Every structure is written in structure tokens, then in C-alpha cells.
């Protein structure tokens, strides 16, 4: 019994780092499209000023 | 005389054998009249009790 624990207990913190990993990288490829404007709102400024 | 006394004594004890004997004779009996075990069970709990330290 306390081996089907262990044995469950375990897939569980597997099941997740796969999903606090699975959503991580789309969790940062937010802030990539966000980071990725930003600096475009950036250059589009230094070139002109204006 | 004495002889005679060890005469009986192994008597005895070929008594408690054929005791015996019967006993598991028996027992098989019942056995054999009837129909998992825990032999395999052993084999299949390391095969888990393993892989789950490799997993």
C-alpha cells in the first residue's frame, strides 16, 4: 500500500513539472511578444526622435 | 535387552514418520480437491519495488 503511495505520490509531482514546465515557456513567450513591441516601440523612436 | 529397548524406540520413531506421513498426505489431499499464490507475488513486487527507484 505505502509503495502504491509512494508510487502515485511520485507520477504526481511528475504530472506537474511537465505542466509548471508546459506552461512556463508559453508563460515567457508572453513576455517575449511584449519585450519584442517594446523594444520596437523603441528603435521605431531612437531613428526618428519624432 | 537394552536392544530390545532401542528395538522399541526405533518403532517409535518409524511411527512418527508414517505420523507425519500422513499429515502432508492430507494436507495434499485437501489440495489437490480444490481449484494467484505467494510465490509470483514476491517476483512481481521487485520487479515494481525496482523500476520504481528507476523511474
Known amino acids: ?50 | 535387552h537394552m536392544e530390545a529397548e532401542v528395538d522399541k524406540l526405533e518403532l517409535m520413531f518409524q511411527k512418527a514418520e508414517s505420523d507425519l506421513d500422513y499429515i502432508q498426505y492430507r494436507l495434499e489431499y485437501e489440495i489437490k480437491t480444490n481449484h494467484k499464490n505467494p510465490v509470483t507475488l514476491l517476483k512481481e513486487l521487485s520487479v515494481i519495488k525496482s523500476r520504481y527507484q528507476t523511474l
Not at chain 1, 509531482?13 to 523594444?39: C, H, P, W, Y
Request: charged share 35%.
Open chain 1, 1 to 50: 500500500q505505502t509503495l502504491k503511495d509512494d508510487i502515485n505520490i511520485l507520477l504526481d509531482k511528475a504530472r506537474l513539472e511537465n505542466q509548471e514546465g508546459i506552461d512556463f515557456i508559453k508563460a515567457t513567450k508572453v513576455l517575449m511578444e511584449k519585450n519584442s513591441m517594446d523594444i520596437m516601440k523603441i528603435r521605431e523612436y531612437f531613428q526618428k526622435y519624432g
